Structure 1
Amino acid sequence: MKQGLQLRLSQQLAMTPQLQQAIRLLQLST
């Protein structure tokens, strides 16, 4: 029962800078 560098995927994600701009576009009032 140890300290060891391990790895196992269960998630997914992706994003681009213009997508970041588009997602912050909805944080603000009209």
Structure 2
Amino acid sequence: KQGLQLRLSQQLAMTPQLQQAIRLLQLSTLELQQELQQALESNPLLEQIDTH
């Protein structure tokens, strides 16, 4: 029966467990550096080795 219902169900779920850290392979070095720059900006606990 067609219908959007809220209920308690006992069903079997497949294994879609993927799509994590996989997009870091297709990128080149430059785009990877851009992503790392974004990550450094958004996370205060990440720092990159410098020379200054």
TM-score class, shorter-chain normalisation, is under 0.3
Identity in percent: 100
Task: Name structure 2 gaps, 5 residues minimum.
Answer: 29-52
TM-score (norm 2): 0.17
Deviation (angstroms), 1:10: 24
Which residue number corresponds to residue 36 of structure 2?
none
TM-score (norm 1): 0.24
Count of paired positions: 28
Structure 1 consecutive aligned stretches of length 4 or more whose deviation exceeds 4 Å: 2-19
Task: Name structure 1 gaps, 5 residues minimum.
Answer: none
Bigger proportion of residues as helix: 2
Q: Which has the higher contact order (CA 8 A, sep 6+)?
A: 2
